[PDB]
């Protein structure tokens, strides 16, 4: 049950295209932050995003629910499922890497999410600029009156 076994057989299972098996077989690897990004790099080449997001949704139930898991989850929800980014990020904003997600969100740059995020992390100055340059989608009369102070 060592990490090496599950991670070695995950690639052969994905090549065999048994995502049911590989899903449960990879839960013991995602828990290791030093073994997560490699798996996502393997999978993006496969393009099986719809198939691995279920594994990531299952990773929340895993006891070792660490931060990099949520960073990658939000990274993929940002552009592959952008409607879900804000909603999923209502919770793990106090659980997820700030700058990597910020620069990663720059691609979709759904400015509302970035503004709300900066407002949560007290980095209000960036939110002011973001509301200044892209206000059509990301602007609110209410909060911009007091955040400015």
């Amino acid at each position: 049950n060592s990490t090496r076994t599950w991670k070695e057989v995950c690639f052969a299972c994905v090549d065999g295209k048994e995502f049911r098996l590989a899903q449960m077989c990879g839960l013991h690897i995602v828990v290791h932050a030093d073994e997560l990004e490699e798996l996502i790099n393997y999978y993006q080449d496969r393009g099986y995003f719809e198939e691995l997001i279920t594994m990531l949704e299952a990773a929340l139930g895993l006891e070792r629910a660490h931060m990099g898991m949520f960073t990658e989850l939000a990274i993929l929800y940002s552009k592959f499922k952008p409607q879900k980014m804000r909603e999923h990020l209502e919770l793990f904003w106090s659980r997820v890497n700030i700058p990597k997600v910020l620069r990663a969100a720059e691609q979709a740059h759904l400015w509302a999410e970035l503004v709300f995020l900066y407002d949560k992390y007290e980095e209000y100055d960036n939110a002011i600029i973001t509301m200044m340059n892209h206000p059509t989608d990301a602007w609110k009369e209410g909060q911009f009156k007091d955040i400015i102070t």
Binding site: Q44, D45, R46, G47, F49, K79, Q107, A108, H109
Partner: peptide, 16 residues
Amino acid sequence: PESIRKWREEQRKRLQ
């Protein structure tokens, strides 16, 4: 299926 092919154009379409 080299999803980067669809992904580049999809992202550009979305942003444009």
